[PDB]
Amino acid sequence: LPPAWQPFLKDHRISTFKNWPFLEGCACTPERMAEAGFIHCPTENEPDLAQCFFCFKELEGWEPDDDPIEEHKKHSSGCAFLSVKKQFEELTLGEFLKLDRERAKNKIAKETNNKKKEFEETAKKVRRAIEQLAA
Amino acid sequence: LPPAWQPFLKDHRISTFKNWPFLEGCACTPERMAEAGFIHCPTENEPDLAQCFFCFKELEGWEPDDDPIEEHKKHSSGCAFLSVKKQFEELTLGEFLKLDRERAKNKIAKETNNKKKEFEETAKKVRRAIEQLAA
Ligand SMILES: [Zn+2]
Ligand SMILES: [Zn+2]
């Protein structure tokens, strides 16, 4: 199972949850999260944050009665994965190759938006410095 | 796509035949050879030979009116690709994964069959060595 293309695997998605806080008795059990495409991205801050393997929308603020499907459609209506209804081994390689192609795109988008924000930041920072020489 | 799984792609197989002699007017064009599962694995000592990427039978002695499917069905009936009638992107990732399972099998078979042939070889050298030491 080619490790680069593994996140299409719900069990792999489940395995990503290292010490995911919410378990039985909760509605966003990590199964329900992986079922929604999310994977665990624990950090120093917000160790509750997960990311959709396909659209890459990141999401925290998780409470036990949050429906990870409902939060995925809400914060990332454009996610193509949400539309996948068949199981993985049930996709034709035509469909699957279209997904991984779209997903790689979604990944460039995340990177592009990110470089752009990092740029505007250093942009804002330099004009402030220049403005200060007017004074 | 994962380079180990690239020979499943007809176009990839076609791309293999570099300096293949038989071209227009021939029955074993690199088109027909690839459609038949062959891949060009030429050597200095056998620049004619192609190998089925799936069952691993290798075949030289190619003449321009050879139909590589009929030469395939001939020398390796047990090859599972021959029964693959669907196009590639129409397989379910389930069936596709089943094939590569069998193909990995076929490669191990070839490995042992080869390890065995190497052994009977060095046996012969050892038997003939001993016999000469009788005289
Ligand atoms: Zn998504
Ligand atoms: Zn074959």
Author numbering:
A (entry chain B), B (entry chain A): 6 to 140
What text does the study give?
Survivin is a small human protein of 16.5 kDa and is a member of the Inhibitor Apoptosis Protein (IAP) family involved in cell cycle division and in apoptosis. In the Baculovirus Inhibitor of Apoptosis (BIR) domain, a Zn2+ ion is coordinated by cysteine and histidine residues [Fig. 1(b)] and the wavelength was optimized for the element zinc in the anomalous X-ray diffraction experiment. While zinc has relatively strong anomalous signal at 9.66 keV, these crystals diffracted weakly, reaching only to 3.2 Å resolution. Survivin crystals are weakly diffracting and have lower symmetry, but they have potentially stronger anomalous signal due to the presence of Zn2+. They also have 69% solvent content, which tends to facilitate density modifications and SAD phasing. Survivin Friedel’s pairs are slightly less correlated in the IBG data than in the CR data, but this small difference can be attributed to the uneven sampling of the crystals with differing quality. Multivariate analysis of the same data consistently outperformed the univariate analysis. We observed the largest contrast between the two methods when their performance was compared on weak diffraction data. With weak data, exemplified by our survivin data sets, multivariate treatment of Friedel’s pairs may make the difference between a solved and unsolved structure.
